[PDB]
């Protein structure tokens, strides 16, 4: 059960991306602020489907 | 009455000093040194009085 976010992605990659783009993850997860999340960022362009 | 009349309200940080005061100064400096990559800015509540 390494999948997360109800997608087919392992936890570790999710953590790595969240860190590398927001320094977020060692203390939980949440929605990063708008001005720190521009158009080409990671989070705005992540859609899970099933 | 002045809150310092009863000690409990001072003990539970309901009224009295702020965050920067009661802490041993070494830890205050430590926190101010690592605000970015390991937060501590929400582990203690500093009260306010009208």
UniProtKB/Swiss-Prot annotation, chain A:
Record site feature (Involved in interaction with pre-protein VI), residues: 25
Coiled-coil regions, chain positions: none
Transmembrane residue ranges: none
Upregulating conditions: Expressed in the late phase of the viral replicative cycle.
Compartment(s): Virion; Host nucleus
Taxonomy, superkingdom: Viruses
Disulfide bonds: none
Signal peptide: none
Additional note from the record: All late proteins expressed from the major late promoter are produced by alternative splicing and alternative polyadenylation of the same gene giving rise to non-overlapping ORFs. A leader sequence is present in the N-terminus of all these mRNAs and is recognized by the viral shutoff protein to provide expression although conventional translation via ribosome scanning from the cap has been shut off in the host cell.
Family, as annotated: Belongs to the adenoviridae hexon protein family.
Complex formation: Homotrimer. Interacts with the capsid vertex protein; this interaction binds the peripentonal hexons to the neighboring penton base. Interacts with the hexon-linking protein; this interaction tethers the hexons surrounding the penton to those situated in the central plate of the facet. Interacts with the hexon-interlacing protein; this interaction lashes the hexons together. Interacts with host dyneins DYNC1LI1 and DYNC1I2; this interaction might be involved in intracellular microtubule-dependent transport of incoming viral capsid.
Role played: Major capsid protein that self-associates to form 240 hexon trimers, each in the shape of a hexagon, building most of the pseudo T=25 capsid. Assembled into trimeric units with the help of the chaperone shutoff protein. Transported by pre-protein VI to the nucleus where it associates with other structural proteins to form an empty capsid. Might be involved, through its interaction with host dyneins, in the intracellular microtubule-dependent transport of incoming viral capsid to the nucleus.
Protein name (record): Hexon protein
Source organism of this protein record: Human adenovirus C serotype 5
Lineage of producing organism: Viruses, Varidnaviria, Bamfordvirae, Preplasmiviricota, Tectiliviricetes
């Amino acid at each position: 059960g390494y999948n997360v976010a109800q997608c087919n992605m392992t936890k570790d990659w999710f953590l790595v991306q969240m860190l590398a783009n927001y320094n977020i993850g060692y203390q939980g997860f949440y929605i990063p602020e708008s001005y720190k999340d521009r158009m080409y960022s990671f989070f705005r362009n992540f859609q899970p489907m099933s | 009455a002045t809150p310092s009349m009863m000690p409990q309200w001072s003990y539970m940080h309901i009224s009295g000093q702020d965050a920067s005061e009661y802490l041993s100064p070494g830890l205050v400096q430590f926190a101010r040194a690592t605000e970015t990559y390991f937060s501590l800015n929400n582990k203690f509540r500093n009260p306010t009085v009208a």
